[PDB]
Amino acid sequence: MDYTPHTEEEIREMLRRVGAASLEDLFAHLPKEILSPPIDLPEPLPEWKVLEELRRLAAQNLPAHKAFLGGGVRSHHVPPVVQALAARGEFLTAYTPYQPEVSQGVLQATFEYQTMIAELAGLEIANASMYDGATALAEGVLLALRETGRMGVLVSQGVHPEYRAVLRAYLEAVGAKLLTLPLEGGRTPLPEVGEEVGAVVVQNPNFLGALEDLGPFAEAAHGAGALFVAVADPLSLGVLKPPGAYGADIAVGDGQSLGLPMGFGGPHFGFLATKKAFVRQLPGRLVSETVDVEGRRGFILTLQAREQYIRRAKAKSNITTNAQLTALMGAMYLAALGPEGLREVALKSVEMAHKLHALLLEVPGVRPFTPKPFFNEFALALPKDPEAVRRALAERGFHGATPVPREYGENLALFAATELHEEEDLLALREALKEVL
Amino acid sequence: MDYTPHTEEEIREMLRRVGAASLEDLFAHLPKEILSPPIDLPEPLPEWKVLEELRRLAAQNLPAHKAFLGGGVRSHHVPPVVQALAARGEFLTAYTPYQPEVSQGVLQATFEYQTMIAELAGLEIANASMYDGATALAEGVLLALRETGRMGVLVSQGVHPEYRAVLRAYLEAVGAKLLTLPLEGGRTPLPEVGEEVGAVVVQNPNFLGALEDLGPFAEAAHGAGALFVAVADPLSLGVLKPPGAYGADIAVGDGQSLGLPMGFGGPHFGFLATKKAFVRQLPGRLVSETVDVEGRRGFILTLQAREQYIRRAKAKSNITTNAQLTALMGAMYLAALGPEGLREVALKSVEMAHKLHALLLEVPGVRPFTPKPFFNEFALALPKDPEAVRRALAERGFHGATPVPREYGENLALFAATELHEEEDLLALREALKEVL
Amino acid sequence: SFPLIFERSRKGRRGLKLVKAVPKAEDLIPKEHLREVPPRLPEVDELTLVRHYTGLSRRQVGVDTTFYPLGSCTMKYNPKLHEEAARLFADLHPYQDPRTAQGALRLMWELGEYLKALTGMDAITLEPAAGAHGELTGILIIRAYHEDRGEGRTRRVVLVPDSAHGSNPATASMAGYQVREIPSGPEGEVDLEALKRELGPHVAALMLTNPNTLGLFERRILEISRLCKEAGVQLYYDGANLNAIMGWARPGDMGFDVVHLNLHKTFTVPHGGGGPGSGPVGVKAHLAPYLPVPLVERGEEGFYLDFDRPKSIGRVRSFYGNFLALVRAWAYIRTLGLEGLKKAAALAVLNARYLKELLKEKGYRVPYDGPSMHEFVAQPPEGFRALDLAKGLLELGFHPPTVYFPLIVKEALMVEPTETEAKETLEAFAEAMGALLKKPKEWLENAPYSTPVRRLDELRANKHPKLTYFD
Amino acid sequence: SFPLIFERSRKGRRGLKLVKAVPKAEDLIPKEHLREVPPRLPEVDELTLVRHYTGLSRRQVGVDTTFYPLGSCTMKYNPKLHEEAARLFADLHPYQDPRTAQGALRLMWELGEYLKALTGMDAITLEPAAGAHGELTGILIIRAYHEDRGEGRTRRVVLVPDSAHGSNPATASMAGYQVREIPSGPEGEVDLEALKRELGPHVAALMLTNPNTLGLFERRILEISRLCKEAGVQLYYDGANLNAIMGWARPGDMGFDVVHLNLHKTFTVPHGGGGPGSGPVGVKAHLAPYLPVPLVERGEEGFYLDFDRPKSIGRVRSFYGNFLALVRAWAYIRTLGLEGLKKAAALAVLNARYLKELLKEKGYRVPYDGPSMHEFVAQPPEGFRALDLAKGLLELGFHPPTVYFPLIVKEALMVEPTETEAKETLEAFAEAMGALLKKPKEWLENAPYSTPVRRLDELRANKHPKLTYFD
């Protein structure tokens, strides 16, 4: 089936109108030897049949709703009011607002998005969002290297391993150096920063769920003339001292925690907030308030001149677009919960996490890894292989024990809890783990 | 939790402005003995917890998708584009359009709805919709009685038993007389119509799926001075001669077959079409085209004077509202499919039904009952109790053998097929039936 | 201007394509049963279909976009949560083995249990539709009661207040009852003396809303009940104003024998531009056997649909009622709980009173203003017509309240803000209401101006009606 | 006038309440780690939230409401079916046992196979995001290839046509390459003499879109490929214009070694106001080893994520890519099949070629007009600025095409109607474009007038920027 409206009569008139003998004639100037190849694709299907097939594939999976898996993605409540609103056709089907006069809905929401992000980070400004947390980190780091004119980077191993991988790829692309600060005791020790370093990167909460006082890290970086980049989960900023309060120059993170469906790691949007002082080097889109010809308040994409300041030297960047829709869902979420609602969701998640921690620690052979204090995620050392445990758990109907790369230690498994987990759910999981071990 | 926006200081100030001491004080004037009774309701739950419970409850049921059950409701393809459109907050949360200047969305859609129902029934006009098919019938008959000034009604037993039951209740309310013409070989025999009769009702297809020639019935009715009322499935109207081509004065039916979700029988909307000559006695809402002060095309609720004619004597009605949203879903469906699309869906469900009927007839003990020609539904005599068969079938994962009341015959079960049933599905059902039998 | 779906149509144009192998009509059914001329349904593509309805929705307003202070309609926020809840139960067939629909039957049962606990009723049906369908059901139940008692020929009158909504008397009359009006005192409440001479073995029932149509609670409701009982008169409760007293008082404790509820008013079910809806009817034990069939019951073997009721009035609608609506109302109650509903009633009342004070500031008059409940009835100052102010509101971005009702108040403005509207919203409304009174008569009489369409020619619509595109 | 969400909030007001018993911070987190000052987030109830965003949506346009002839963006209808499809896989975690996510993995694998068949590629990554992300991925792959063959220090140049989008050279330049611009012929196609003169062992790759940015198919593509292979130059395919040739020609058969696709363009994934999107990258056998990790593979035991790629360039973004977008693309392809995609391309080209004729009749010029494909570049007659014509379009209820691109055509209007727009819509648009040329100069330079806001002070926005509410 197809979506074209053309009736055969209309197709005839149009072909005659452009001087074509047929649809095939439209491609007559292309090289004949490669036209209409015998491509193999399954035969077309009516929409209902496509849904049946989609449902059958979904039935092959074990849903992860209320899962205990963590490490960048968690099963939080996805408020239907946010999803209903982001489903409005005007938001779903619009494109980059290059014509501001008919795009005030998108331009204003983006403005509100930037201010909410800058507040959560305790910083002055923020762009209209990045693809995800990892790309946001890469871009934030390049901003720093550009600002200081340096090419050296120090990153804590506590930073999400995939984030460090995306970062390595970008740094390798622009010709920069990356040094990884190994974690000891689950935290990152204060490093001695050389003048070749333009950026120091630390995550809080840790990838293993550990809280880290970033204050001294920022000092260590400024003392060497380097910039400090903080990677923080937006949801945790609801109750944790923000990077801005620590004196961080740049703050990045992933927005999946802000009510976005997990969608197998798909749904994301990265945030990037910094000081107005570095706005020339700020990548991505920027929406500014302004006024129309008769004084009405309006919003519009601004400061595109930045494209020049960003490519004038080393550590170039080329962000062409953002993650508008998902960033919009984030803003709707932040606006739906407010300062207190966000704080509550964060605390509940931390509470159920700490309670789960104490429960799992009772299983024989199970020892803690992540030190105190930690947030809503934690790593435990298991007596069996974590990948084997996760599978055993899955076979029992539970999703847990997200495997930690062994660069952090052997037999380590991450666990996360959210506001939708209850006392009874933790006990269930513990039981299961008990029997698995 | 609650949806109230009032903050504590806001509540206090408002109370001071209305001269009330507290919230409870607002009810000070009610008699003390009824005040704040101990009502027992479960404790409040946060939205996610509520969804979790809904899901638990839904997990108890066996989904009826691709079900083979019939008798008024059938599992047809519910198109997402229609559901997405009907979900637009403006349609979903608007009220009856009494202020037309800001309700042209609903009003125009309703006007388009009306013309679609009239075309499908092959009649001149139609109201904005009734609650369901059953009530649509009761109101139609009453329109027939007020019109003719008589109080006698002849109803074919072929009409869905529930529609008749609803009709019976409505007739007893206004003090009319209801006579039922029993089916002979699954078909309604041409009755003799006396002058005491004002309405003759027949359904095509029959409740048992048999096609009935409405021609003779129209004549018989008109000969006696009675009006002819036809009960028809809207979907079937896509390929079957409509009640208007047969002479029917009034046509009613249920719109669930127009892509509406089954919703355990909840979702419905009844249509009512008739002669423009009887508009004066038409119940429900009516939208007319017109113009505004400057000549712009507009739509508005009209002819409210009908209320008087309807209550001037006997068989009066009092339908104060309709089924706007669901009627609208029907409209979007008809528009989404068009004439040829509707015809295809009808023909397809018919083809599958006939294939099924052939297969089931091969099972030992299964005897036909519904005579040919029949539409997309049919009844068969089973070697065992239909209810028991339906249970046995359900236990196997199939939804079939919808029970037919003993009034139609012994051990009779109905089966239905839709455009989403494939031969493989027909064969699977037959195997299951073969097994239990 | 905006095009009609029919004008957008093009001969042979296709939208949805749900069949891959279209069978020949001729091979499946005999020619004398096949449609000759196809119905003139619109022929449009999907994109067009989307543009059309999306475009229509943008020429429309709802609670989602505007403040709807409609008296007796309770235009409260319809939580998006409930839409998600309902599609969870879309794939259920009414006739499937009840053994496989226990989740749905249970939800129906629990809701029935909650509504009964809220209204003080002993049994309940969730079958009746919206509008007056439930009103009719309740009236037919009362008639069955008297009839079963042998008083069918003497119980011929139904009493209604002079402020009642026209639907009350219309339903009774339809049910064959003679409707007699009873005046209200100068306070706006029932006239007890007048009532006393109306009661007797000739009255079948008294229909009332409480608070009444003026938004005033009937302070002597217990006396009215006492009088109705000594005379054997059934006290009928029109639940349109239940929102004002949810949790603070049960109508059953007030003496009402039957209660008509509106899920699309009090329990957040969306108004949908008219419908659909749900009007459950709760009744006291003595009227229980007359309830329409079927009812949802709980046995040891689970939940089942019960039809075994010899005295039932029969069936008032197909299947079991608007199930999805029930789902939504269930969610609402399980969300708020007693305290949530109570708070709701309280702030719905607070809002009305607060908004009444603001309007009285600009001269709007309140003929009967005792302590207001969920709504109130005002009149514009002398010299202004409710119609023009209503059209003025449209231009200003608001939606007027219920106008011209009750009829005992000229130029009536029945205002019900509901508990979900904010203080600053009430003020913005009062502010627009006051500004319109400063507008020249000519401005008011020709409003709106910027709406998609301006005042419509109602005369032409009535004398020259065009009910379809193919008139 | 439309209020900001921050203006809608009230101190202490609550919206969503997801926690029953909120714990005390001091009991879970040490004082020194606790936020001192709360973030200044909005404090609004749910109704307000709905009013705010619904209201914002009504101050916005999309494919759902307006014709979007945006050149190089392929603004085609986004089937609502795909949104239903997407929610079916919402509850999946990337780190759950892959043995329990076979349906998602299988879908990713199949989409992989489909995209490869349409593209003529041997391997593919579905990981990269929208924008230039996939573009960067492909370039890095070309660099890895040369570096591995030991010519990394010599292959230092990337060639781009003068009509290329700034994105191409910006990405290459960011990857450490020196970019050389190649002029096109009088017809707007690649100048073969200029290319031959320019090719050599120093050139890492040649980046092209085919059809090119002028909407013209590069008729000598086979010669260009032969030339590039002779010099060992990798031919890179920017897939922005794939919509013109789906099914009629495979980029692989034209000699392209790497293909950058855009699901949010050619395969209906919604544009969502800028993103998110998906930019898969297809590759010929000799480049597959450098693909970013992980890739979705099929084994006898099942589908799995392959990370064992010793020569991989690494990871370019988190997890596995925009999975929900992949789902949509999959649904689309499984809906149309080869014949549906082939027909879409044909009609996308017919619509553009037809609209071009209509615009030329309306007085517009077409600098490079050989047979037009899915798009074309027009210019207004001398004296008119595309900028002004665009603003007038806004006033006339249409959305302008891409403006001021490609750069080689002054006052350029890059028009791409896509296959889902109707014939009469193209005509209505042409009528509007024509009527604008008849409008007085002042009316044009001061448009729009009826839109939510008129022309905006872009200068104040740049010199006096206000990037946040609290600025």
**DSSP codes of every residue in C167-180:** HHHHHHHHTTPEEE
Q: How many Cβ contacts (< 8 angstroms) between chains A and B?
A: 22
Q: Is residue A277 located within the same domain as residue A360?
A: no
List phi, psi (to 5°) of C313: -70, -10
Beta bridge partners of B368: B380
Structural element, H or E, at residue A161: helix A161-174
**What SS3 state is found at A152?**
strand
Residue C85: which of C324, C288, C435, C422 has the closest Cα?
C324
Q: How many Å apart are CA A431 and CA A381, to the nearest integer? A: 17
Residues in chain A: 437
Q: Which residue has the tokens 């000052």?
A: D37
Domain boundaries, chain D: 1-60+457-471, 61-75+344-456, 76-343
Burial class (CB in 10 A: 0-12, 13-18, 19+), B294: exposed
Q: What is the CATH number of the domain that holds A127?
A: 3.40.640.10
Q: How many Cα atoms within 13 Å fall on the side-chain side of residue D161?
A: 27
Q: Is C186 on the interface with B (CB under 8 A)?
A: no
* Helical spans, DSSP H, in C18-91: 25-28, 46-57, 81-86
Q: How many Å apart are CA A75 and CA A62, to the nearest integer? A: 14
Q: How many Å apart are CA A262 and CA A76, to the nearest integer? A: 8
In a domain, B164, yes or no: yes
Contact list, D45 vs chain B (CB under 8 Å): 3-5
* Helical spans, DSSP H, in A361-422: 386-395
Residue B200: which of B166, B233, B243 has the closest Cα?
B243
Q: What angle do CA D70, D76, D80 make, to 5 degrees?
A: 140
Amino acid at site D224: I
Q: Is residue B263 located within the same domain as residue B145?
A: yes
CB-based contacts of C2, cutoff 8 Å, min separation 6: B104, B108, B297, C55, C56, C59, C452
Q: Is A335 on the interface with B (CB under 8 A)?
A: no
- To the nearest 10 degrees (0 to 180), the angle between helices D133-148 and D167-174 is 50
**What SS3 state is found at B72?**
coil
Are A141 and A199 spatial neighbours (Cβ–Cβ below 8 Å)? Answer: yes
List phi, psi (to 5°) of B133: -65, -45
Are D386 and D412 spatial neighbours (Cβ–Cβ below 8 Å)? Answer: yes
**What SS3 state is found at C190?**
strand
Q: How many Å apart are CA A200 and CA A215, to the nearest integer? A: 12
Q: What angle do CA B266, B269, B270 make, to 5 degrees?
A: 130
Q: Is D65's CB within 8 Å of C77's CB? A: no
D365-370 long-range contacts, Cβ below 8 Å, gap at least 24?
D367/D188, D367/D409, D368/D187, D368/D188, D368/D214, D368/D216, D368/D409, D370/A29, D370/D187, D370/D188, D370/D189, D370/D216
Contact list, A318 vs chain D (CB under 8 Å): 132, 136, 167, 170-171, 174
Q: Is residue A301 located within the same domain as residue A163?
A: yes
CB-based contacts of B221, cutoff 8 Å, min separation 6: B193, B197, B199, B200, B227, B228, B249
What's the first-to-final CA gap in chain A, in angstroms? 52
The 10 Å Cβ neighbour count of residue D150 is 9
**What SS3 state is found at C332?**
helix
In a domain, B381, yes or no: yes
DSSP3 helix / strand / coil % (chain A, rounded to 5):
40, 15, 45
CATH architecture of C1-60+457-471: Other non-globular (6.20)
Q: What angle do CA B59, B65, B71 make, to 5 degrees?
A: 115
**Domain D76-343, CATH:** 3.40.640.10
Beta bridge partners of B179: B154
Amino acid at site B375: F
Q: How many Å apart are CA B155 and CA B334, to the nearest integer? A: 29
Q: Is residue B144 located within the same domain as residue B219?
A: yes
Task: Report the relative pairing of strands D157-161 and D178-182 from DSSP bridges.
Answer: parallel
Q: How many Å apart are CA C162 and CA C408, to the nearest integer? A: 7
Torsion sign across C-alpha atoms C423, C425, C426, C431: positive
- How distant, in Å, are the alpha carbons of C193, C372, C400, C405, C415 from that of C71? 29, 13, 10, 9, 5
Q: What angle do CA C163, C169, C170 make, to 5 degrees?
A: 130
Are D247 and D342 spatial neighbours (Cβ–Cβ below 8 Å)? Answer: yes
Q: What is the CATH number of the domain that holds A352?
A: 3.90.1150.10
What tokens appear for D133 in the block? Answer: 């992300």
B270-274, strands of its sheet edge to edge: B125-126, B270-274, B250-254, B227-231, B197-203, B152-156, B177-181
- How distant, in Å, are the alpha carbons of A330, B394, D77 from that of D129? 18, 46, 21
Q: How many Å apart are CA C461 and CA C324, to the nearest integer? A: 36
Q: Is residue B366 located within the same domain as residue B326?
A: no
* Centroid of chain to Cα C304: 29
Q: How many Å apart are CA A411 and CA A389, to the nearest integer? A: 10
Q: Is C47 on the interface with B (CB under 8 A)?
A: no
Q: Is B77's CB within 8 Å of A419's CB? A: no
Residue B266: which of C317, C315, D348 has the closest Cα?
C317
- How distant, in Å, are the alpha carbons of A206, A207, A342, D307 from that of A203? 5, 7, 20, 25
Q: How many Å apart are CA A433 and CA D274, to the nearest integer? A: 44
**What SS3 state is found at B409?**
coil
Q: How many Å apart are CA D286 and CA D276, to the nearest integer? A: 30
Residues in chain B: 437
Q: Is C54 on the interface with D (CB under 8 A)?
A: yes
Q: How many Å apart are CA A239 and CA A346, to the nearest integer? A: 7
What tokens appear for C394 in the block? Answer: 């449209």
Q: Is B420's CB within 8 Å of A48's CB? A: yes
In a domain, B380, yes or no: yes
B377-381, strands of its sheet edge to edge: B367-368, B377-381, B412-416, B402-403
Q: How many Å apart are CA A325 and CA A332, to the nearest integer? A: 11
- How distant, in Å, are the alpha carbons of A160, A388, C108, D306 from that of A402? 13, 11, 41, 18
Q: How many Å apart are CA C426 and CA C347, to the nearest integer? A: 12
In a domain, B49, yes or no: no
Structural element, H or E, at residue B109: helix B104-121
Q: How many Å apart are CA B108 and CA B296, to the nearest integer? A: 13
Beta bridge partners of C236: C207, C258
Give yes or no for a cis peptide into B31 (omega within 30° of 0): no
Are D206 and D241 spatial neighbours (Cβ–Cβ below 8 Å)? Answer: no
* Helical spans, DSSP H, in A22-122: 47-58, 80-86, 89-92, 104-121
Question: In degrees to the nearest 10, what's the CA dihedral of D297, D298, D303, D307?
Answer: -30
* Helical spans, DSSP H, in C120-213: 133-148, 167-174, 192-196
Q: What angle do CA D150, D152, D155 make, to 5 degrees?
A: 120
Are A334 and A300 spatial neighbours (Cβ–Cβ below 8 Å)? Answer: no
Beta bridge partners of A155: A180, A201
List phi, psi (to 5°) of A362: -80, -20
DSSP 8-state symbol, B362: T
Q: Is A427 on the interface with B (CB under 8 A)?
A: no
Q: What is the 3-state secondary structure (H, E, C) of chain D?
A: CCCCHHHHCCCCCCCCCCCCCCCCHHHCCCHHHECCCCCCCCCCCHHHHHHHHHHHHCCCCCCCCCCCCECCCCCCCCCCHHHHHHHCCCCCCCCCCHHHCHHHHHHHHHHHHHHHHHHCCCEEECCCCCCCHHHHHHHHHHHHHHHHCCCCCCCCEEEEECCCCCHHHHHHHHCCCEEEEECECCCCCECHHHHHHHCCCCEEEEEEECCCCCCCCCCCHHHHHHHHHHCCCEEEEEHHHHHHCCCCCCHHHHCCCEEECCHHHHCCCCCHHHCCCCCCEEECCCCHHHCCCCEEEECCCCEEEECCCCCCCCCCCCCCCCHHHHHHHHHHHHHHHHHHHHHHHHHHHHHHHHHHHHHHHCCCECCCCCCCCCCEEEECCCCCCHHHHHHHHHHCCCCCCEECCCCCCCCCEEECCCCCCCHHHHHHHHHHHHHHCCCCHHHHHCCCCCCCCCCECHHHHHHCCCCCCCC
Q: How many Å apart are CA A269 and CA A129, to the nearest integer? A: 6
In a domain, A8, yes or no: no
- How distant, in Å, are the alpha carbons of B70, B274, C400 from that of C48? 33, 30, 33
Are C139 and C281 spatial neighbours (Cβ–Cβ below 8 Å)? Answer: no
What tokens appear for B382 in the block? Answer: 């089973």
Contact list, D7 vs chain C (CB under 8 Å): none
Q: How many Å apart are CA C263 and CA C112, to the nearest integer? A: 12
DSSP secondary structure string for all residues of B278-302: GGGG--S--EEEEEBTT--EEEEE-
Q: Is residue B112 located within the same domain as residue B140?
A: yes
Beta bridge partners of B83: none
Q: Is residue B361 located within the same domain as residue B283?
A: no
Residue C297: which of C445, C97, C110 has the closest Cα?
C110
Residue D453: which of D71, D183, D56, D102 has the closest Cα?
D56
Facing residue for C10 by CB, picked from A1, A7, A46? A7
Q: Is B48's CB within 8 Å of A87's CB? A: no
Q: Which of B298, B324, B340 is the last residue of a domain?
A: B340
Facing residue for D28 by CB, picked from A266, A293, A354? A354
Q: How many Å apart are CA B248 and CA B239, to the nearest integer? A: 17
Q: Which residue has the tokens 């996610």?
A: B48
Residue B174: which of C278, C317, C170, C321 has the closest Cα?
C170
What tokens appear for C3 in the block? Answer: 């095009």
Q: Domain count of chain B? A: 2
Q: Is residue B132 located within the same domain as residue B222?
A: yes
Q: What angle do CA B218, B220, B221 make, to 5 degrees?
A: 65
Q: How many Å apart are CA D147 and CA B170, to the nearest integer? A: 86
Are D38 and D11 spatial neighbours (Cβ–Cβ below 8 Å)? Answer: no
D402-403, strands of its sheet edge to edge: D376-378, D413-415, D402-403
Is domain C61-75+344-456 in CATH 3.30.450.20, yes or no? no
Q: How many Å apart are CA B359 and CA B374, to the nearest integer? A: 16
Q: Is residue B273 located within the same domain as residue B310?
A: yes
Facing residue for C81 by CB, picked from A3, A4, A80? A80
Q: Which of A305, A340, A375 is the last residue of a domain?
A: A340
Q: Is residue A179 located within the same domain as residue A310?
A: yes
What tokens appear for C452 in the block? Answer: 């998609």
Residues in chain D: 471
Q: How many Å apart are CA C260 and CA D281, to the nearest integer? A: 63
Q: Is residue B147 located within the same domain as residue B263?
A: yes
- How distant, in Å, are the alpha carbons of D362, D387, D446, D447 from that of D443? 19, 13, 5, 6
What tokens appear for D299 in the block? Answer: 């084994």
Q: Which of A280, A308, A340 is the last residue of a domain?
A: A340
Residue A377: which of A118, A125, A76, A156 has the closest Cα?
A76
What's the first-to-final CA gap in chain B, in angstroms? 52
Resolution (angstroms) equals 2.4
Contact list, D19 vs chain B (CB under 8 Å): 46
Q: How many Å apart are CA A87 and CA C80, to the nearest integer? A: 12
A227-231, strands of its sheet edge to edge: A125-126, A270-274, A250-254, A227-231, A197-203, A152-156, A177-181
DSSP 8-state symbol, C360: H
Beta bridge partners of B229: B201, B250
Binding region of B: 321
Are A68 and D92 spatial neighbours (Cβ–Cβ below 8 Å)? Answer: no
Residue A271: which of A116, A129, A143 has the closest Cα?
A129
Give yes or no for a cis peptide into D211 (omega within 30° of 0): yes
Q: How many Å apart are CA A15 and CA D372, to the nearest integer? A: 13
Residue B415: which of B364, B362, B349 has the closest Cα?
B349
Residues in chain C: 471
| Host domain of residue B397 | 58-78+341-437
In a domain, A187, yes or no: yes
Chain A: residues touching C (Cβ < 8 Å):
1-5, 7-10, 44-48, 80-81, 83-85, 89
Residue D13: which of D56, D48, D44 has the closest Cα?
D44
Q: Is residue B374 located within the same domain as residue B264?
A: no
Torsion sign across C-alpha atoms C461, C462, C468, C471: negative
This structure was determined by X-ray
Core vs surface per residue A107-145: b (16+ CB within 10 A) or e: bbbbbbbbbbbbbbbbbbbbbbbbbbbbbbbbbbbbbbb
